[PDB]
Ligand binder design. Structure first.
Ligand code: FL5
Lengths: 12, 91
């Protein structure tokens, strides 16, 4: 994954 | 995951953390944990503190983020770890 993709998981 | 109730808990960041949050556009003095994470992520994106090959790996030894979190590095996969490092920078 990209950094953004990993970080986005914190949003859920 | 991390419980939704914890995600929308209201917190007040210490001055250094707050400075970091506002530097990427945050305007408030108190935030939910989710909001804090949102702006924190922006900070990391802009400074590209992640590893190019494995982008869940964050290197922050030479950054103010490292001073705050008190670690040379951490994994984005480790959500609870991240929450804890935040909880240690709250008023
Ligand atoms: C890979 C980065 N990314 N992926 N999905 C979203 C984001 C995102 C992008 C940016 N910039 C490019 C500056 C900033 C912040 C985010 C972001 N960080 N966390 N989240 C959700 C936990 C996002 C995000 C939010 C949303 N909305 C607001 C629609 C819920 C969409 C996409 C991303």
């Amino acid at each position: 994954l990209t950094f953004a993709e990993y970080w986005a998981q914190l949003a859920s | 995951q991390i419980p939704a109730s914890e995600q929308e808990t209201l917190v007040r960041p210490k001055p250094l953390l707050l400075k970091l949050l506002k530097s990427v556009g945050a305007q408030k003095d108190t935030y939910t944990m989710k909001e804090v994470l949102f702006y924190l992520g922006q900070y990391i994106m802009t400074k590209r503190l992640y590893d190019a090959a494995q982008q869940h790996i964050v290197y922050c030894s030479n950054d103010l983020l490292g001073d705050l979190f008190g670690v040379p590095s951490f994994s984005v996969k480790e959500h609870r770890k991240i929450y804890t490092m935040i909880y240690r920078n709250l008023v």
